[PDB]
Design a protein around this ligand. Structure first.
Ligand SMILES: [Ca+2]
Ligand SMILES: [Ca+2]
Ligand SMILES: [Ca+2]
Ligand SMILES: [Ca+2]
Ligand SMILES: [Ca+2]
Ligand SMILES: [Ca+2]
Ligand SMILES: [Ca+2]
Ligand SMILES: [Ca+2]
Lengths: 188, 188
């Protein structure tokens, strides 16, 4: 009847998941939150491991993922934070939440905008996801074109509205904002 | 005890498949070879349909795939031609066969080499596979760089040896030369 306890019906009702899926994700949370410390929290040390091990997103953005998973900004990931952040990757999650999440992700230093050098590290990382590794001048041409396309109110930084415009023209930037195995999950 | 008959053990023994998988692929061949004419042959009219329907590779290269599937150059695909060509996409198929197959595929007009304008239509099609649609001058820069990289014996056309060199540096050009569902197949 314990501390940290959260009725799975609760998360079920605010996410694309169901009770059984929420209960299921609790098993997976116990795994990741116990690796090193056994306090019911996923320390970032243990987030790394879990992404490193059962590969999901990407190693160099784990500090980025960890950071946005960390909704109540307090240095760790709690169970409900973990389920709600994951729920955003669900195929039925509203595209709004996916666009927003992707935006926090790319705001590399957490400043409320996307600056050119962050669009760059972004584009590089996405390219490399699709096994394309291009010359540095191929890249700043690309990044330059995409950056003036995106920076509508011409002022050197992308805000969430221009991002939304930008992504509507570039829907593949939020390609990975959805993981299709999450529709019915796989016991292990 | 019929015409067209081929002992599945035969194909089993010359391809990564097993008897049961060969027998299985016969069911799938009957489907595709009967759509329009019921002669035990996949006419190209019926190859289109099958790629169009249960999507596999890509629509504009169906005439290219059809063409290399068509090993005994005679305008149709016979059962054993179909199993042997498919077997090449198997995860355990030797990389040699994958490189060779990919080469015949890109030799768009069938001239025994890859010419610059074919590397171009190639690169465009691969880019578009990974949801990247680039400016025409981004593209001839890319195609120009890749083309002089590949055209070692400097003479305006890529032969199979230079292709093999080229692909060893660019292993993602034969990414699609493997279909992982083929490891154990899916009844329908
Ligand atoms: Ca812990
Ligand atoms: Ca937190
Ligand atoms: Ca930022
Ligand atoms: Ca702006
Ligand atoms: Ca037929
Ligand atoms: Ca033939
Ligand atoms: Ca050619
Ligand atoms: Ca050459």
């Amino acid at each position: 009847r314990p501390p940290g306890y959260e009725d799975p019906e609760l998360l079920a009702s605010v996410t694309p998941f169901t009770v059984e899926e929420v209960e299921a994700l609790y098993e997976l949370f116990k795994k990741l939150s116990s690796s090193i410390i056994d306090d019911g929290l996923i320390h970032k040390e243990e987030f790394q491991l879990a992404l490193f091990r059962n590969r999901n997103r990407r190693n160099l953005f784990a500090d980025r993922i960890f950071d946005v998973f960390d909704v109540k900004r307090n240095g760790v990931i709690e169970f409900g934070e973990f389920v709600r952040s994951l729920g955003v990757f669900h195929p039925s999650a509203p595209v709004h939440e996916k666009v927003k999440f992707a935006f926090k992700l790319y705001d590399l230093r957490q400043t409320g905008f996307i600056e050119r050098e962050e669009l760059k590290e972004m584009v590089v990382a996405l390219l490399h996801e699709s096994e394309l590794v291009l010359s540095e001048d191929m890249i700043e041409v690309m990044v330059d074109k995409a950056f003036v396309q995106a920076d509508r109110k011409n002022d050197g930084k992308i805000d969430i509205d221009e991002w939304k415009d930008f992504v509507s023209l570039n829907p593949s930037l939020i390609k990975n904002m959805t993981l299709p195995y999450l529709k019915d999950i796989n016991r292990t």
